[PDB]
Symmetry: D2
Subunit: 308 residues, 4 copies
Amino acid sequence: QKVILVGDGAVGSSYAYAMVLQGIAQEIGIVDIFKDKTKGDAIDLSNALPFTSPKKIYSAEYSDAKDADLVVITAGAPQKPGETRLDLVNKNLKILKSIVDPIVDSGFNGIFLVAANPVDILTYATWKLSGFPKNRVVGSGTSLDTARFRQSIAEMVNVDARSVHAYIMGEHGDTEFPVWSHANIGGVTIAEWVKAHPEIKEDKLVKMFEDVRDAAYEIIKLKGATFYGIATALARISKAILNDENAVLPLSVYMDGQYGLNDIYIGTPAVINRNGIQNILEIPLTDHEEESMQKSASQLKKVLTDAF
Amino acid sequence: QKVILVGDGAVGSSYAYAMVLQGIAQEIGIVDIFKDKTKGDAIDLSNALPFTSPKKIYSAEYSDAKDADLVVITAGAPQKPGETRLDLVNKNLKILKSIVDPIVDSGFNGIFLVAANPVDILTYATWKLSGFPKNRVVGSGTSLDTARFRQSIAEMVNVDARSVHAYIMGEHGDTEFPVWSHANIGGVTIAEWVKAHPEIKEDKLVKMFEDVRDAAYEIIKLKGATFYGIATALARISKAILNDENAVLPLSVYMDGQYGLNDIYIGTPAVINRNGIQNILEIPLTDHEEESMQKSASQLKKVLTDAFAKNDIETR
Amino acid sequence: QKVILVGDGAVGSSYAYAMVLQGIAQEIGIVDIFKDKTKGDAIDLSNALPFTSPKKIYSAEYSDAKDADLVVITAGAPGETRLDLVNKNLKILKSIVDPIVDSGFNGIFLVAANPVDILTYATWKLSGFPKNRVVGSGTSLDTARFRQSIAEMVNVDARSVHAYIMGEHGDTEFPVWSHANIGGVTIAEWVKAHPEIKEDKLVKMFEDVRDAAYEIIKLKGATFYGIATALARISKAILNDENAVLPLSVYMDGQYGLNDIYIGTPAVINRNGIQNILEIPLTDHEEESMQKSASQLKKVLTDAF
Amino acid sequence: QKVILVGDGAVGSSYAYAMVLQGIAQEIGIVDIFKDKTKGDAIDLSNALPFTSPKKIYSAEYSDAKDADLVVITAGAPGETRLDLVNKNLKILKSIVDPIVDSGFNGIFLVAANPVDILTYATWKLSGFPKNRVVGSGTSLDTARFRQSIAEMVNVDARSVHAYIMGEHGDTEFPVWSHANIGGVTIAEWVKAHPEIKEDKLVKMFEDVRDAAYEIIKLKGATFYGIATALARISKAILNDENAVLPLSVYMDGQYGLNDIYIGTPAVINRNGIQNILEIPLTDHEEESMQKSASQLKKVLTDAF
C-alpha cells in the first residue's frame, strides 16, 4: 500500500499527517516542486510514527510513482480574487498536466485521487490527460460535505450519525445540492421524521445545508485557506481504496447515462475499492432535484467545453 | 458503567468475555444460582483483562444491581421436545420472576436488556413483572439476525456492510421477516440492484434469509446450543446503551400504535441510548409484510395471556 | 494469514472466539474429532463476524493445514496423575502432528496443550521442524497477569511494568523479582522509596497468580478465557510479524545453563517463529529456581520417551 | 475532559488536529492573539469530526480556562541568541499564564514552548501552581523517536525497547545507554550477541534524533508534527489518568543531585499531575552528562531573570 502524494501544501501536508495518525497506508512519498520542504515534512512526519502504526515516509519524485498504488493530487493554484474561473481552470490545467504526464511515464498503474479544486473538472482533466480507465480516476467530490451534512443532521435529530443516510450531489461547490427526498434516518425519510417530530423545523434543516455548503468560503475568509476537513476525507477515501473496502462515498465519477448525464465527472454515490469505482449509484431523484443535478452539470459542462 | 449479568451459562459467559475483549463497560457483576461457577468465571475473565482495557469483574448477588446501569438477563430454560411452547413460557416466567423481583428490590433503576427466549415474550414479561417504564426494558429482538443478514447481502453484492441497510422484523424466531421492499445498498433498493446486476439471483437472496433465520436451529442440532452470535450482539447493544450512542437497532420494543399494533413487544428498528428507547422507527411496509406483522403479533399476544393467566392464578 | 485450530474444546473454542472478536487472522480452520461441534461452532462464530472484521471460519481436516501459516494445538483431555496425563497426550499429539506434517504444512506450531513445555518439546521431536518453528504458550499468560497485578498495586500503567515468570509453566515456575522493574526502577528500589508496598503482598501476589488456574478449575471446572486470550496475542505477534517479546516455551541451547528442553523465558517472536531467546541476568537463588524447575522437567521428559 | 490550547501556530494547530484525529479529550478551546485564525481553524477542525470521535472545538479566550482540566502552552516564537529567545518567550509566557490563572483555572499546565525546560520552570514560578501540576514535554518525543529507531535497527517491537534520553531538551540531552535495554537485555549485552549492530551506528543514531529538529527547521522552516503528536499523547496520559511513564520536564528535588530546576527525567503522570519522578541508575559519565546539562541550564535560567 504505497501512496504518492503530489502537492505538499496545507492540504497535502495535513493529509499525510492524517494518514500517519490514522495508520492508513504503509509507504508515503511526498512530491512537490520544492524538494527541501518535502524532505523536512518527511522527517517531521516520521518523528510522529512512534505513536502510530509503522510507515515509510520520504520526499519523492514522480518516478517513485512507478510502484505506487495510489496517487493523490492536491497541488492546485487558488483562484485570484479577480479572475475568470476559466483562468483558474486554465492555470490549474497546466499545473495538472505537468503532474500527470511525468506520473504516467513512471509506469504507474494504480488509482488517481484528485482533490485539487475545482475537483470535478480536474478529475475529468486528469482522466483525459492520463488516458487511464474511467474507474481509475476519482475525485473527492462531495464526500466531505456529505459527511458533515450527515453529522449535523445526526446532532439535530439526536441519532447516531452512522444511521443518517443523506447525499449532497452535483459539482462540488456553489451548485451542489442535498437529496432531501431520499435522505433518511435509519430507514425513515427526513420528511416522515419531521412529520413525526415537528420540533425538527424544515427551515433550520435548509440553513444547515447552506452552512455546510458555504463553510469552505467562511474558513478561507478567517484563516485564509481550508485543509483539515478536506485532508481527513481525503484520508478516508484513501483508506477505502487501499483496503479494498467497497465503501459507498459521494465521489467525482464518470457519467455515462446516470441521471441522463454524459461524458463528465460529477458527484454521486459510488462503490470504491482497490481497483477504483466498482459501481456508480443512481439514487431516485425528485424531478425537482433532477433539475438541480441538471443545472449543476450544464454549468460544469460548459467550462469543461471551453477549457479544452 | 456498571453491568449486572444474570445467567452465567454459555450465552451469559460468552457475553461477559465479549465485553472484556471488546472493552465495553467498566464493571461486570456476574449472577447465577450456581455461585462457584460465577466466581471461577470472574477470576478466569479477569486474567484476560491484561490484554484489554481494565474492568472490575466479580461474582455478584441481585443486591449489587442497586447502582447498576444495566441488567442483562440471559437466564432461560431450554425447550425440551414434548412440551407446549406455552410450558416453555410458563417455566421461563417463573425463572424471570425469581430474577426481576429481587433486582427491583435492590433499587436498580437502570436499563433492562432481555436476551432469554422467546425474547419478545420474555421482554414484555420482564416489563410487566418489573413495573419499569416501557422504554427502560428492551429485548435483543432481531438485532443479531439483522446484522448477520446485512453482512451476507454485503458479501453477495460485494459492498461494505456499513452501506447495507436491511431489516428483519417481527417476532424473533420462525416467523420473523425481511423487509425486502425497503432494504437497499447505499440508497439503491435490492430490487433495483438485482435489475442492474442480474448475477445477483433472487432465490439465493431469499435462501440466504432462510439460512440466516434458521441458523440458530442448525447450530443447536450440531453443537447443542448457540451463544457466540447472540453474545456478540448483546455486547453491541450493551455498548449502544452504556455509551449513550442513539444507535438504530432492530430491537424488542413496546408497541403503542406503530404498525397498527398495541400492547406487546415485537421487533422493529429503534433508537437506543443510556435511557433506553428514544425512538421507534416505523419502516414503511408492504400490505403483506404489515399482515405478517399483525399475525406475528396476535400469536404473540395469545401466548402471553395464556402464560400470565396460568401464572397469575396458580402461583402459590 | 491462515490458521488451523486443532482441538475444539473449551480452550480451542474460546481461542477462536478471541481471534474473531480481536480481528486476528483472515481464516480459521477448526479441526476436532467431533465434526458436528466444529461445524456448528464455525457457524456460531461466523455470526459474530458482522460485529468485527471479516474472517473465514469452517470445520477443517488436518489436510487443510497444507497452506496454513499457523497450527495451534489445544487438544488433550483435562482423578489423573500428570505422568499418565503426559502419556495420553503424547499419543494424542502424535495423531495430530503426523497428518498435519504430511499435508505439507511448513508453517509455525503453537502448542497450548498441557503440560505445555513438555508437549511443546514433543511437537518439535514429532515434527522434526526447527527448534524455532515450534512454540509453546509458556508463561506469557501468567506473566501478563503478574505484570497487571504489580501495576494495580503500584498504580503505574502496566505497559511500563517489567517482570517475568520463567521455568516450566506450572507449579515450579518462579518470578524474577531481582530484574523486575517499574519504569526502569527495580521492584526492590521502588519498595524502598515506597514502603506502603509490602513484600508479603508482593510475595503472595505471585503465588495467587501461579495457583489461579487451580482455583478456576475447582470453581468452574476448567480454565479457558485466560489462556485463550494469551494464545490469541501470541497468534497475532506471529501472524503480523511483530518481533514481540513474550515469555514463550523456547528450546534451550545453553541459556541459564540448560540444554535440550523447551522452557519458559522471554523471546522475540515473528512470522518466522522465534527470532531470539533472551537471557535475563539471574540471582543465585533465581538461578536455582530455574535450575530446579528444569531438572524436574528434564526427568519427566526423559521418562516420557 | 476540556482543554485550552494557547497558541494557534503550526504546533498548536497541529496539536489540535492530532487531538481530533486520535480522539483525545471532548472539548478544545483554541486561544490565540489572532482570533479569526483560531475561529476558522475551529470550524475547519470541526469538519473533520465526522470522521472521528465527537468533540466540541471553539475559538476561546483565556477566561474559558476557568473550568479547563488542562492548558497547553505552545505560544513562543520559533537569527537568534539563546538568551534573547528565552527573554521574549518569558514575556509571552507572562502574558498567557497570568490571565489563565486569573480565570480560576485549577487544572494542569502542559508547557511545550522552547526552550521547554526553562519555560516550564517559568510557568511554575509565574503560575504559583504545585510543582507536580506544571509539566513540560521535555524529551518525550526524542525518547520516543530514539526507542523506535533502536527497534528498527535491532528489529524488535518498540514496546519492548526501553531507553531514556534525559537532561535539558536541546543540544545537551544524552542517552542513558548503560540502562537502555531490549526486553530486559542490555543494549551492551545485546550488541555482544549481535555483532552486526555496532556502537558506531548507535551513537550516530542518537545524534540524529537530537539534531533532527534542527534539520527540519532548515528544510521546511519549522517543526510541528513530531512535537504535536507527542503533546497529544502526554495530554492523553493526563486526561485519561493513565499513570504513564514519560520523560517529562519535572521539578528536581535532589534526584540526580539536582535541585530547584525543571529537567528531563522518566516520570509517572496522571489526571492530577506528576505522581513519581523516577531515578534511573546513572554511570559516572552519564551522571556527569546530567550535571553538565543541568548546570548550564541553571546558568541560563538565572541570567534570564
